DNA sequence: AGCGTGGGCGGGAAAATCTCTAGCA
DNA sequence: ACTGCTAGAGATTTTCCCGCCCACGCT
DNA sequence: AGCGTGGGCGGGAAAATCTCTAGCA
DNA sequence: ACTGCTAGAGATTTTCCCGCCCACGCT
C-alpha cells in the first residue's frame, strides 16, 4: 500500500485519471479520486452522465416505428406503435425506464412527443429531458446513419419474417448482435454492459463517500499525545487507517486515531 | 483471479459463499472457500464481483 | 423360517402391518420386517424427502403465462438474477409468445428457455422462432410446478406489488409496467443488497470479463503435468493444469477435474 | 429531517421501496427505514412466522366430519394418544353427532370437545347433550384448519388405510371398521413403539394413578416454607412445599411455582 | 397500546389498523372499530 | 438388591406370594420374580385357557327392539348396541366394533339363531378370536351377567324420561353405568378397574414378549478367580458390570468380562 | 414415585424427554430432564409409564 | 436392476412397478411395460432390490 | 524358541436420532 | 378469550461385536 | 494526598444470520 | 434424458462504543 506517494507524481506529470492510478498502484479508489481532485488543471464536468438516450421517429409502410438510442454505448432499439399519440410514448418510455436506468431523454418538440401524459410519467420517473439540444453534437449524424443502417437491415430481413414487427424484432436482435466491430469486434451487449457497470461503480463510490464527509477524525501521532485533527477519513484500514488533515496522505494506527461519530 | 462466487450444494436449501474462483471453463468451475477445491458444476454456480470490494 | 415369521406373513396379509410391529411381536431382525413391508405391493410408501435442484446458469431464461382479471400475462425471469419483464398478451397463442421471446433475445443474451407444457408454449411457431434465434428449448416435468418455482414465486411477487400500485394508474398494463419497474429497480436486498438490475449486470459483466480473461490466459499459459498418484508408482500424464495450488495442484488428466498433491505431481514447462 | 428523507418519503409514495433501499440511497440508519416502511398503510406485509400450540391435556377430544365417496364420516381422536374412532353418519345433523358424542363419553373419560364451526357442530341438540353429559365445549378460529388439523392428519392416515383395505371387504363401512381397527391396534411406532390403544391405556392409567397418589401424599405431607428471597433479607412465608430439592426446593407461596434455594428457604414442620 | 393489521382468513388482502384487546400466544382478540374479532398470529401483524 | 433374592425366596416358600408382590416389594427385576414363582412346587397354577378378554354376549328384545349387550366380565365392564334387524351381519359388525376398540380375545355366547351365522365366523377369523358357546370360563359370574342386565334395565327405567328416542336413552344409560354406579374397595366408577386390568395385562404380556426372545439365547460364563468357561447358562438380566444368570438352579451374578453371549 | 414425562416447549413442534416427574397439580407440572426444574402447563404435558421400564 | 413405484401426477393412488432406464438427481426415466416416462423423486420410490 | 492369551481396531451391522416432506377439501 | 400436526425415508451418527491380529504372558 | 489517564465492562445499538412461513391455481 | 423456490419478521447472536468508573500513573 506504498503507492500513495507515487500516484501523486503520476497525476502531476501525465495527469492520468483515477482509474489508471487506482488499478496500477492497487489502491482504494477514494485516494485516486482525491488525488485527481487535487489536480488544479484537469477536471471533468457532469451533465459525465452516461444515461444519455435519444428519441427519433419514423413512419414506415404507414406504421409508426419509435426508435430509442443509448447514446453512451451506441445501443439502439425500436418498437412498433399503432397510433401516433402521447399514451403510446408514455408506455414506451416507461418500458425503457423499467428495463434500463434512463435519466437523459433527447428528442424534438414535435406534436407526437409533447403530450402531458409523458410529462406525468416523467414526473413519476424523474428524468432530465432534452428537446432538440445535443449533449454533444458528434453522434447526431451517427444516429441518423444508424437508423438508415437499420432500414437496410429491414431490407435484408423482411424476407426473414411475414409480419412487420416480427421482422423489426429480428432486425433489432441482429443489430444487437450481428453488427460487430470496434476495438474488440464486440456485440452491442458487450459494450453496453461495460457502459452501465462503471456508472454503477462511480455512483456507488459517490454514495460511499457521501456519509464519510460528515465524519471527522481526531488523531494523535506516534511517540507523542499531540491530538491533531479533525482530518478527513479516506480508507478505514484494518490496523492503519488512511486520512488527510490538510494535504498530507497519512497512514495512522487505529490506536493513534479516534473517530467523530457524526 | 480475484473475484467472488456464491454457490450451493445439492440437497441443501441455502446458498453459500463467497468463495474465490480458481479456474473456469464452461461446464465445471473450481472454487475455494478456505482450503477446499469445490468442483461445482455450472448449474449450481453464481459468479459475480460484488461492488463492496472497495474496502477489501 | 420361524412359525412366528409365517404368522407375521399372515398378519401382513390381513392388516398391512408396520415393520416395527412385526419386529416386536415375533422378535424379528429389522431387515426381514423391512422386506415384508416391501413384500406386499399394496404396502407402498409416500416417496422420498428431498427437493431437486433448479439449474442456475446465466444462459437460461424462464417464462410462464399467468392469469389475472381474466387477462393472460406473460412473465419472463432471468434465473441467475431475477431480472423480470412482464406484459399483457392479446391472446394466449404461440406466435405472440414467439414475438415476446424474440424481443427477449434481442434485448438480452438468452440461450436456454425452461417452461412448462402449456398450450401457448407448444406451437410450431415458437419452434421456428427458437430455431431462428438459436435458442435451447427445454421443458419441465409434465405436471410438476416445482421446476418453474422461481418464476411462480415471482408471479406471486409482482401480483403482490400490483396489489400495492393498481390504484395510481387506470388500466392494467400501465400499473403492470409501473410494478415491473418498481421490482426491477426499486426493490433492494437479496444477494448483495442490489436490485436485480445491478445483479444481472454483475452476472453478465463478470461472465464476459472472466471468460475472455481466462481465454487470454490459456493461450499464453501451457504446462503439462505428469503425476504418480497414490496406491501406485507409475507416472501418469500429461495433464492440463487448471490452477497451481500450494500443497496440492488441480489438473485435468483426460476428462477428470482432479486434485493431485505437488509431491505426487510433476509440472513440465511443455 | 434531511432533504433526502422527505425525498425517500416521496420515493416510498411512488414506489413503496424497501427499508434497505432508503438506507442505501440516503445513508440512513435502519430505524427510520423501518419507520418509513411502517409509514405507508398500503405497504402492509405478509405477517408473522411462528406456529401456535395445540393443547395436549388428556381430557380433550378432537371431532370432525369428513367426506368420502359422497358419504359423511364422523371421526373423533383423542389428542394425547391418537386413539381413533370413526363412523358413517346417516346425515350431517347435530342430533346424530350428539349420539356419537354420547357413545364417546359413555365409553371414554371425555371432558372437553374441540371442533371447527361446521353446521352439524352448532345445533342446539349438541349443546343440550353436552350439558347433559357435562362436557366443556370449545371451537376454534373460524377459518383456520390448523388448530383442528391434528385430526385432519389422522383423516389423511385413515383414508390412506381405507385405500389399503377397501378391497378386502365388500361394503364400505365394514372396511372402514376394519381400517380403524387396524390403526388402533396394529399400527405400531410413534412415541415408544406403541399402537395408540395401549397409549390411551397408558395416559388414562397414569392419570388415575398419579393424582390419587398425590392426593394420598398431600394429606400426610404438609410443610410450610418461610423463605427469604434474593435482593431481600425478609423471610416471606408460608409456602406450600411441592418437592424438596437438593440445592433448590420448589414451592408455591400464593400463586407462584418458585424454585427457591434451600439456603434461601426455611421448611417449618407445620 | 399497539396498532394491529391483519389478513382476514380465507382472503388474500389485508386490513387494519385496529386495537389489541387481549394478546394470546397464537391468536389475539381485536377491536377494529366495533368488531371484536380474534385472529391468528400467522395472518396479522402488531406494530 | 442382589441380596434380596433369598429373602424373596423365603417369602415365596412360607407365604407363596406371586411375582408381582416380590417384584414391587423387594424392588427386584421382574424376571427373577417370575423365575422364583416358577421354581415353586405348589405355586404352579393353571395356564390361560389370566384372560382380561372375558366377554359375555347376550341379546334382548326390549320394546320389540334389539339390544345386544356385551360384558367385559373380567373386570365388570358392560356396553350394548341398538340393532335394527336380527341377522348375523349386525352381530359381525358389533363384534368387529368391540374388537376394534378393545382387544377382544374371548367371547362367550349361546348357539342361538342370531349369533350363529357364517359372517360372524369370517369376522372372528379375520380378527383371530377364541369363541365359546354356552360354556362359562368360570360359572361364578353367570348370575352376575343376568343381574347386571336387570340393573341396566332398571337404569333404563330411570332415564327413559331423560331422552326421547330409544337409543339416546340407551347411550345415556350405558354412560351412567360406566360412571354413576360406584363402589368396590376404592369407590371407582366403572372404567378405572377395567383400565387397571388392561394395563396390567399389557404389562405382563409385554414382559412375556420380553422374555420369549431371551430363552433362545445362551451365555457361556466363567467367574472371578477362574478363567474356566462353564455354562452355557441362562441370562436373566443384562447388566452393567454384574449380570444375573442361572447355570443349573442358582441365581448368580457374574462380571460382564467373564461372559460370552450366544445371540441365538 | 418416579415417572416418565414426554413434553415440548413453545414455538417448537418437537417433543422431548423423557423427564422425571417431581410434582403434579392440575394446571402446572414440575418435571426434571437432567438438572433443570421445568414448569410446564397441563396442556403441554405427556405423563406415561413405559412397559419397558421393567428393564430400568 | 431395481423395481420402482410412483405417485402419478395430480393423483393420490400409486402404480408400478417399472424398470429403471436412467436415474437422475431429481427425476428418473423408467419403463413400466411400454411407458418410457420420467418421474420426480418426490413423486416416486425405487425398491432397494 | 516355541506356545498361549489379551487389547484395541476396524469392519460392519445395526440402532437411535435427525431431518424433512405429503398432505389433510 | 386463542394457538399445525403427524406417519414414513433415507442420512447420519453412534455403538456392540467379532475376530483377529498384533501385542503380549506360559513351558 | 491530590491530580491525571487506562482498561474492561456493561448497556445498548445495531448488524449479521437462523429460521421459518405464505404462497405461487 | 431430469430436479422448489424466494422476499420478509422476529429471534438470536455478535460486535463496536462509550462512558465510566474503578483502577491505576504522575506533581
Ligand atoms: C364446512 C366447515 C366450515 C368451516 O370452513 C370449512 C372449510 N374446511 C377446510 C378444510 C381443509 O382445508 N383441510 C386441509 C388442510 C389444509 C391446511 C391445514 F393446515 C390443515 C388442513 F386440514 C377442512 O379440513 C375442513 O374440515 C373444512 C370445514 O369443515 N369447513
Ligand atoms: C395449463 C398448464 C398445463 C400444465 O398444468 C397446468 C396446471 N398449473 C398449476 C400451477 C400451480 O399449481 N401454481 C401454484 C404452485 C403450487 C406449488 C408449487 F410448488 C408451485 C406453484 F406455482 C401453475 O402455476 C401453472 O402455471 C399451471 C399451468 O400452467 N398448467
Ligand atoms: Mg405454468
Ligand atoms: Mg403458473
Ligand atoms: Mg371439518
Ligand atoms: Mg377436515
Per-position DSSP letters for F11-64, written without gaps between them: HHHHT---HHHHHHHTT--HHHHHHHHHS-STT--------S-EEEEEEEEETT
CA-nearest residue to D150 within chain G is: G13
C67 lines ligand 2 (CB under 6 A): no
String of DSSP letters for C176-199 = HHHHHHIIIII---SSSS--HHHH
Cα gap C153→C157, rounded to integer Å: 6
Q: What Å value separates CA D112 and C1' J3?
A: 17
Residue pair A49/A25 in contact by the 8 Å Cβ criterion? no
Interface membership of C27 toward F (CB under 8 Å): yes
Cα gap F207→F29, rounded to integer Å: 11
The three-state (H, E, C) secondary structure of A12-60, written as one string: HHCCCCHHHHHHHCCCCHHHHHHHHHCCCCCCCCCCCCCCEEEEEEEEE
The parent domain of residue A254 ranges over 214-260
C144 lines ligand 2 (CB under 6 A): no
Cα gap D225→D259, rounded to integer Å: 12
CA-nearest residue to H12 within chain C is: C46
Residue pair D261/D244 in contact by the 8 Å Cβ criterion? no
Cα gap G17→G4, rounded to integer Å: 8
Cα gap A245→A238, rounded to integer Å: 20
Residue pair B35/B24 in contact by the 8 Å Cβ criterion? no
Q: Do H40 and C53 touch (CB under 8 A)?
A: no
Q: For residue G27, is it within any domain?
A: yes
Interface membership of C20 toward D (CB under 8 Å): yes
Which H or E run includes H7? strand H3-7
Of A28, A30, A201, the CB nearest to B51: A201
Q: What is the SS3 assignment for D57?
A: coil
Q: What is the SS3 assignment for C24?
A: helix
Name the nucleotide with the smallest C1'–CA separation from C145.
L4
Please count the other Cβ atoms lying within 10 Å of the Cβ belonging to residue C268: 12
Residue G55: list chain F partners with CB under 8 A: 29, 210, 237
What is the rounded end-to-end Cα distance, in angstroms, of chain E?
10
**Which amino acid residue places its CA nearest to atom 8 of ligand 2?**
C145
Q: How many domains does chain E have?
A: 1
Q: A residues 192-221 near D, CB within 8 Å?
A: 207, 210-211
**Which amino acid residue places its CA nearest to atom 15 of ligand 2?**
C145
Q: Do F172 and D102 touch (CB under 8 A)?
A: yes
**Residues contacting residue H10 through CB under 8 Å, at least 6 positions apart:** C143
Cα gap A26→D11, rounded to integer Å: 37
Cα gap G40→G55, rounded to integer Å: 28
Q: A residues 32-71 near D, CB within 8 Å?
A: none
CA of C72 to the centre of ligand 3 (A): 11
**Which amino acid residue places its CA nearest to atom 10 of ligand 1?**
D145
CA-nearest residue to G40 within chain D is: D257
**Residues contacting residue C199 through CB under 8 Å, at least 6 positions apart:** B48, C81, C82, C83, C190, C191, C192
Q: What is the SS3 assignment for C240?
A: strand
D143 Cα to chain E: minimum distance (Å): 6
- Covered bases, chain J (protein CB within 7 Å): 1-11, 17-18
Q: Chains near B, with 3+ CB pairs < 8 A?
A: A, C
Cα gap H49→C35, rounded to integer Å: 10
Which H or E run includes D101? helix D94-107
- Covered bases, chain L (protein CB within 7 Å): 1-11, 17-18
DSSP 8-state symbol, D108: S
Query: Across the beta sheet with D112-114, what order do the strands follow?
Result: D84-88, D71-78, D60-68, D112-114
Cα gap D56→D34, rounded to integer Å: 38
Query: Across the beta sheet with A249-253, what order do the strands follow?
Result: A217-220, A227-235, A240-244, A249-253
Identify which of A59, A156, A44, A49 has the alpha carbon closest to the alpha carbon of residue A110.
Answer: A59
Q: Indicate yes or no: strand K within 7 A of the C-beta of C116.
A: no
CA of D35 to the centre of ligand 6 (A): 41
Residue C45: list chain H partners with CB under 8 A: 45
C134: left (phi over 0), alpha (psi -120 to 50) or beta: left
**Residues contacting residue F248 through CB under 8 Å, at least 6 positions apart:** none
Spell out a b/e string for F31-58, using b for 16 or more CB atoms within 10 Å of the CB, else e.
Answer: bbbbbbbeeeeeeeeeeeeeebbbbbbb
Cα gap G44→H42, rounded to integer Å: 33
Q: What Å value separates CA D147 and C1' I24?
A: 12
Report how many Cβ contacts below 8 Å link chain D to chain E: 45
- Positive/negative CA dihedral, A186, A187, A193, A199: positive
Q: What Å value separates CA B51 and C1' J4?
A: 43
Residue G54: list chain F partners with CB under 8 A: 29-30, 203, 207, 210
Sole residue written with cell 438352579: F249
C19 Cα to chain F: minimum distance (Å): 17
Residue H16: list chain C partners with CB under 8 A: 41, 44
**Residues contacting residue F178 through CB under 8 Å, at least 6 positions apart:** D106, D107, F77, F79, F189, F190, F191
CA A46 to chain centre: 10
Cα gap A135→F78, rounded to integer Å: 100
Ligand 1 pocket test target in D62, D114, D116 with most atoms within 8 Å of CB: D116
- Residue D82 vs residues C22, C146, F99, F206: alpha-carbon distances, Å: 20, 33, 17, 21
Residue B55: list chain A partners with CB under 8 A: 28, 235-236
What is the greatest pairwise CA distance in chain F? 83
- Residue C235 vs residues C229, C240, C260, G33: alpha-carbon distances, Å: 8, 15, 12, 61
Of D14, D25, D27, the CB nearest to A124: D14
Grid cell digits, residue D22: 432508503
Cα gap D224→D238, rounded to integer Å: 5
Grid cell digits, residue A80: 412498433
Q: Do D217 and G1 touch (CB under 8 A)?
A: yes
Question: Which residue of D51, D57, D79, D240 to mutate against G (max G Cβ within 10 Å)?
Answer: D57
Which H or E run includes C214? helix C196-220
- Helix (DSSP H) and strand (DSSP E) numbers for chain F: 8, 10
Task: Please report, to the nearest 10 degrees, the dihedral formed by the alpha carbons of residues D62, D68, D71, D75 taken in order.
Answer: -10
Residue B56: list chain A partners with CB under 8 A: none
Grid cell digits, residue H16: 408400478
Interface membership of H36 toward C (CB under 8 Å): no
C149 lines ligand 2 (CB under 6 A): yes
Cα gap D154→D75, rounded to integer Å: 9
Q: How was this structure determined?
A: cryo-EM
Question: Is there an interface between E and H (3+ Cβ pairs < 8 A)?
Answer: no
CA of D146 to the centre of ligand 1 (A): 8
A182 Cα to chain C: minimum distance (Å): 16
CA of C115 to the centre of ligand 3 (A): 7
CA of C153 to the centre of ligand 2 (A): 11
Residue pair C227/C238 in contact by the 8 Å Cβ criterion? no
CA C160 to chain centre: 25
- Positive/negative CA dihedral, C37, C39, C41, C47: positive
Tell the burial category of B21 from Cβ atoms under 10 Å away from its Cβ (0-12, 13-18, 19+).
buried
Please count the other Cβ atoms lying within 10 Å of the Cβ belonging to residue E26: 18
Q: Do D25 and A207 touch (CB under 8 A)?
A: yes
Interface membership of B53 toward C (CB under 8 Å): no
Q: Considering only CA atoms, which residue is closest to the C1' of nucleotide I15?
A: C30
Residues 177-216 of D with CB under 7 A from strand J: 187, 189-190
Task: Please report, to the nearest 10 degrees, the dihedral formed by the alpha carbons of residues F1, F6, F11, F16 taken in order.
Answer: 110
The parent domain of residue H20 ranges over 1-47
Indicate the resolution in Å.
4.5
Q: Considering only CA atoms, which residue is closest to the C1' of nucleotide J10?
A: C48
Radius of gyration of chain G (CA): 11
Cα gap H6→C141, rounded to integer Å: 14
Breaks (C-N over 2.5 A) in chain G follow: none
Residue pair C81/C203 in contact by the 8 Å Cβ criterion? yes
Q: What Å value separates CA F213 and C1' J23?
A: 38
- Positive/negative CA dihedral, E16, E17, E21, E26: positive
Please count the other Cβ atoms lying within 10 Å of the Cβ belonging to residue A45: 6
Identify which of F206, D18, D158, A165 has the alpha carbon closest to the alpha carbon of residue C196.
Answer: D18
Amino acid at each position: 500500500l506504498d503507492g500513495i506517494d507515487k500516484a501523486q507524481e503520476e497525476h502531476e506529470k501525465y495527469h492520468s485519471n483515477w482509474r489508471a492510478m487506482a488499478s496500477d498502484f492497487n489502491l482504494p479508489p477514494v485516494v485516486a479520486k482525491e488525488i485527481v481532485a487535487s489536480c488544479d488543471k484537469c477536471q471533468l464536468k457532469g451533465e459525465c452522465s452516461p444515461g444519455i438516450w435519444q428519441l427519433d421517429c419514423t413512419h414506415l409502410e404507414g406504421k409508426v416505428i419509435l426508435v430509442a438510442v443509448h447514446v453512451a454505448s451506441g445501443y439502439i432499439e425500436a418498437e412498433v406503435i399503432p397510433a401516433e399519440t402521447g399514451q403510446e410514448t408514455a408506455y414506451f418510455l416507461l418500458k425503457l425506464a423499467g428495463r434500463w436506468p434512463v435519466k437523459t431523454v433527447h428528442t424534438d418538440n414535435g406534436s407526437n412527443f409533447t403530450s402531458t401524459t409523458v410529462k406525468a410519467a416523467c414526473w413519476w420517473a424523474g428524468i432530465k429531458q432534452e428537446f432538440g439540444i445535443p449533449y454533444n453534437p458528434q453522434s447526431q449524424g451517427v444516429i441518423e446513419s444508424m437508423n438508415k443502417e437499420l432500414k437496410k437491415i429491414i431490407g435484408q430481413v423482411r424476407d426473414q419474417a411475414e409480419h412487420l414487427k416480427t421482422a423489426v424484432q429480428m432486425a433489432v436482435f441482429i443489430h444487437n448482435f450481428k453488427r460487430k466491430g470496434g476495438i474488440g469486434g464486440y456485440s452491442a451487449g458487450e459494450r453496453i454492459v461495460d457502459i452501465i457497470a462503471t456508472d454503477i461503480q462511480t455512483k456507488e463510490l459517490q454514495k460511499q463517500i457521501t456519509k464519510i464527509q460528515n465524519f471527522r477524525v481526531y488523531y494523535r501521532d506516534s511517540r507523542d499525545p499531540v491530538w491533531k485533527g479533525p482530518a478527513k477519513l479516506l480508507w478505514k484500514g484494518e490496523g492503519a487507517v488512511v486520512i488527510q488533515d490538510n494535504s498530507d496522505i497519512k497512514v495512522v494506527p487505529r490506536r493513534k486515531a479516534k473517530i467523530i461519530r457524526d | 483471479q480475484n473475484f467472488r462466487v456464491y454457490y450451493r450444494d445439492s440437497r441443501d436449501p441455502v446458498w453459500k459463499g463467497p468463495a474465490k474462483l480458481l479456474w473456469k471453463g464452461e461446464g465445471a468451475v473450481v472454487i475455494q472457500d478456505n482450503s477446499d477445491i469445490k468442483v461445482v458444476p455450472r448449474r449450481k454456480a453464481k459468479i459475480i464481483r460484488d461492488y463492496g470490494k472497495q474496502m477489501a
